[PDB]
Amino acid sequence: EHLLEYAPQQIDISNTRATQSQFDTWYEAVQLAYDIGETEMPTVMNGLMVWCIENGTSPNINGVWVMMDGDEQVEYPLKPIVENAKPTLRQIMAHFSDVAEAYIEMRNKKEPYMPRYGLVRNLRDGSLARYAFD
Amino acid sequence: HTVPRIKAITSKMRMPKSKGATVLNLEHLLEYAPQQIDISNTRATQSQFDTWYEAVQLAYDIGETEMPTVMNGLMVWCIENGTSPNINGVWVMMDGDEQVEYPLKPIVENAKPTLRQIMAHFSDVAEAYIEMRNKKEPYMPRYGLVRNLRDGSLARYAFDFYEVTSRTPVRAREAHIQMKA
Amino acid sequence: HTVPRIKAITSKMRMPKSKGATVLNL
């Protein structure tokens, strides 16, 4: 009587997506590392995935990621993000996979815009670009 | 009577949430559109290019308003001989017929993460320069001559530090693809 | 609006002191 009523979403119980308990830990841990309060970090995470779209999700820990204000680049250390992401950054970043395609398609209607995941692998198509991030 | 139209479906789309609050503000995403090559990783960071610019400036003991002349010939050399030379080497730049030599150790050593990514900042000017010097005599950089690039028009996309942006021609992208020939 | 830049940190650097007075003149 419970199985004929228990229908969970496939992606919620999946293993490719990191657990909701393991995403909150990564969210708060990165929040503590950057010394950025709430109601302001969403701006930082607003540009984290845009960077991760272009440059994949397996970068060097000692590196740095960039986000633009107008024309000036701002830099955030990459060590807290990769180090505090369990089991890995890709699975933690998969929570944004629903928004990434909506963002890529939004920026593909005015000029061609292909993430580097496709350019390196020679993805010779225009419409199939919103499914081309790591 | 009225034909029975199919009830349109609506794909709910899952926001990434954290303790009942979303982690993304959408009024900023619907307005945040950075240039692809600026946030890219193939091009070295603007903060990592200024360091390489000043460091090489200090190493050559050449003041400002004069170094642009030196950098005017650095990329021309780098077009012909790639961007991964020996550190202990030397690069050449001509005044008329006389060659002048600059040590290659400061340039390669102080280039982070690598010389190619630091030199990619000139990739927009290199094709404009190659095309300018290709309209009077055939002029193919050695990156193409070694790999047998059998074309004349597709020569301005044939240097080592060319960055594949979204707007390069498809023929250029494949022309980069074969790599070693 | 303006991107939230990371508050630069400043590594204090410990002078060798002796009875409240430094032993090095910089």
Residue numbers in the entry:
A (entry chain Ah): 68 to 201
B (entry chain Aa): 42 to 222
C (entry chain Ar): 42 to 67
Which of the paper's sentences describe this entry?
Potyviral CP plays a role in virtually every step of the viral infection cycle, from transmission of the virion by aphids, virus assembly and disassembly, regulation of genome amplification, protein translation, to cell-to-cell and long-distance movement. CP consists of a highly conserved globular core flanked by two large extended regions with a high frequency of structural disorder. The C-terminal high intrinsic disorder region (C-IDR) is partially conserved and packaged in the lumen of the virion, supported by the helical ssRNA scaffold.
In the absence of ssRNA, the N-IDRs adopt two slightly different conformations, as seen in CPr and CPh allowing the formation of two different types of RNA-free filaments, with the stacked octameric ring assembly being the more stable and therefore predominant form. The RNA-free filaments with stacked-ring architecture are predominant and thus represent the most stable form of CP self-assembly. In wild type VLPr filaments, the N-IDR is responsible for the axial connection of the octameric rings, with no obvious interactions between the core regions of the CPs. In RNA-free VLPs composed of wild type CP, each CP subunit is linked to four adjacent subunits, with N-IDRs acting as clutches.
